[PDB]
């Protein structure tokens, strides 16, 4: 098992990624998670992270891990539209089974004392072995760590598996002020993304929309979790995916098993200018620019099977 820290934005797929990571203890040792008040009010995201962790901890061999609320603030907020859906998960019956909430309530205080970014920095730097950061939300936190600790931080990162950007496909940020070339996580904080993608000595695996677009949330598959209602994770996963792509889940799946996707190096830069394409992750020919390993043609079935099986961990 390799150390993994989940740096997420608290949206539905962030939690599916969390489930994926957490449930695969053979491959992943989830030593921490941080939630950014991005796709949600860090509040609900933080709580759901904890409720999921506790549900898992009380039902399978998943060690408790610190959970930090990131202090990162958006450059460009996620649409209020979806965004705060963690609020809705916070209230799902599956995440409010008494023994689990009882645990969360007991360990909540210890977690409330963490500042997400510093926790990310500490978890990575103080780990004996290198840490794989699964970033399913904006890059504000990994960027903060780099800005603050440079190499002391990046050298301790096995690799940063990032869900974000759109390299050779359209983005998904369609607003009156944008040209749709940017992807949401990058668009949330382009500057931090620039820092991360341009950081040499930081191995980055990038699950841009190029790969995530090829593995959409399909009804028949989601209904298969109904075949596993005896498993809490299936009720959990099935329920989340049954709400308004497996972006983050795909990203986390890779962390569990890189067979999820081949990756090809691409020098990725980010447009941080308040321009229509703000947040666009673009190929750059600038010499010696750091390479990012963009996932390509993910193994949809492999991933879909992985998720279904992982959803049986408990």
Q: Does 97 bind a second copy (CB under 8 A)?
A: yes
Interatomic CA distance for residues 307 and 225, integer angstroms: 10
Q: Does 248 bind Ca ion (CB under 5 A)?
A: yes
What mask of x and - would describe binding to ligand AD3 in positions 44 to 83, judged by CB under 6 A? --------------------------------------x-
Residue in 6, 7, 14, 75 binding ligand AD3, rule: CB under 6 A: 14
Contacts of 54 (CB under 8 A, 6+ apart): 64, 100, 101, 103, 104, 107
Residue in 44, 49, 76, 136 binding Ca ion, rule: CB under 5 A: 136
Q: Does 214 bind ligand AD3 (CB under 6 A)?
A: no
Q: Please compute, for residue 302, the number of CA atoms within 13 A of its CA located in the half-sphere on the CB side.
A: 16
Q: Does 211 bind ligand AD3 (CB under 6 A)?
A: no
Q: Does 254 bind ligand AD3 (CB under 6 A)?
A: no
Pick one of ligand AD3, Ca ion, a second copy, none as the site partner of residue 200 (Cβ within 5 to 8 A by kind).
none
Q: ∠ at Cα 166 (165, 171), nearest 5°?
A: 100
Q: Does 184 bind ligand AD3 (CB under 6 A)?
A: yes
Residue in 225, 247, 254, 303 binding a second copy, rule: CB under 8 A: 225
Q: Does 39 bind ligand AD3 (CB under 6 A)?
A: yes
Q: Does 226 bind a second copy (CB under 8 A)?
A: yes
Q: Does 15 bind ligand AD3 (CB under 6 A)?
A: no
Nearer to ligand AD3, 25 or 277 (CB): 277
For the bound state, the minimum distance from the C-beta of residue 48 to a second copy, rounded and expressed in Å, comes to 11
Residue in 4, 9, 240, 246 binding Ca ion, rule: CB under 5 A: 9
Residue in 33, 163, 250, 256 binding ligand AD3, rule: CB under 6 A: 163
Footprint (CB under 8 A) of a second copy, residues 50-89: 82, 84, 88-89
Interatomic CA distance for residues 188 and 74, integer angstroms: 6
Pick one of a second copy, ligand AD3, Ca ion, none as the site partner of residue 184 (Cβ within 5 to 8 A by kind).
ligand AD3
Pick one of Ca ion, ligand AD3, a second copy, none as the site partner of residue 93 (Cβ within 5 to 8 A by kind).
a second copy
Q: What are the backbone dihedrals phi and psi of residue 30, each rounded to the nearest 5 degrees, phi first? A: -80, 100
The count of residues interacting with ligand AD3 (CB under 6 A) is 14
Interatomic CA distance for residues 150 and 146, integer angstroms: 4
For the bound state, the minimum distance from the C-beta of residue 168 to ligand AD3, rounded and expressed in Å, comes to 15
Interatomic CA distance for residues 47 and 65, integer angstroms: 14
Stretch that binds Ca ion, among 94-102, 129-137, 175-183, 304-312 (CB under 5 A): 129-137
In terms of Cα–Cα distance, which of 69, 56, 74, 75 is closest to 275? 75
Q: Which residues bind Ca ion (CB under 5 A)?
A: 9, 11, 14, 136-137, 248
- What residues line the site for ligand AD3 (CB under 6 A)? 9, 11, 13-14, 39, 82, 136, 163, 172, 183-185, 247-248
């Amino acid at each position: 098992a390799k150390n993994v820290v989940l740096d997420h934005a608290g949206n539905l797929d962030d939690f599916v990624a969390m489930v994926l990571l957490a449930s695969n203890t053979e491959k992943v040792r989830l030593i921490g998670a941080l939630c950014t008040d991005a796709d949600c009010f860090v509040e609900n995201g933080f709580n759901v992270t904890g409720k999921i962790m506790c549900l898992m901890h009380n039902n399978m061999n998943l060690p408790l891990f610190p959970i930090g609320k990131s202090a990162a603030t958006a450059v460009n907020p996620f649409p209020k539209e979806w965004r705060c859906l963690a609020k809705n998960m916070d209230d799902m019956p599956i995440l409010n089974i008494p023994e689990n909430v009882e645990l969360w309530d007991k360990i909540k205080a210890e977690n409330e004392k963490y500042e997400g970014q510093q926790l990310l920095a500490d978890l990575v730097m103080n780990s004996e072995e290198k840490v794989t950061i699964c970033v399913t939300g904006p890059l504000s936190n990994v960027a903060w760590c780099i800005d603050k600790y440079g190499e002391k931080f990046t050298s301790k990162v096995e690799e940063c598996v990032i869900m974000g950007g759109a390299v050779d496909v359209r983005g998904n940020v369609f607003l009156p002020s944008t040209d749709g070339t940017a992807e949401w996580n990058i668009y949330w904080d382009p500057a931090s993304a620039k820092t991360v993608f341009g950081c040499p000595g930081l191995r980055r695996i990038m699950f841009s929309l190029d790969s995530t677009n090829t593995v959409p949330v399909r009804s028949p598959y989601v209904q298969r979790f109904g075949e596993q209602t005896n498993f809490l994770l299936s009720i959990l996963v099935g329920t989340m995916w049954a709400m308004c792509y497996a972006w983050d889940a795909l990203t986390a799946a890779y962390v569990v098993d890189q067979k999820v996707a081949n990756v090809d190096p691409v020098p990725i830069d980010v447009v941080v200018d308040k321009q229509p394409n703000e947040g666009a992750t673009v190929r750059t020919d600038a010499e010696n620019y750091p390479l990012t390993f963009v996932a390509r043609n993910p193994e949809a079935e492999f991933f879909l099977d992985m998720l279904l099986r992982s959803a049986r961990a408990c």
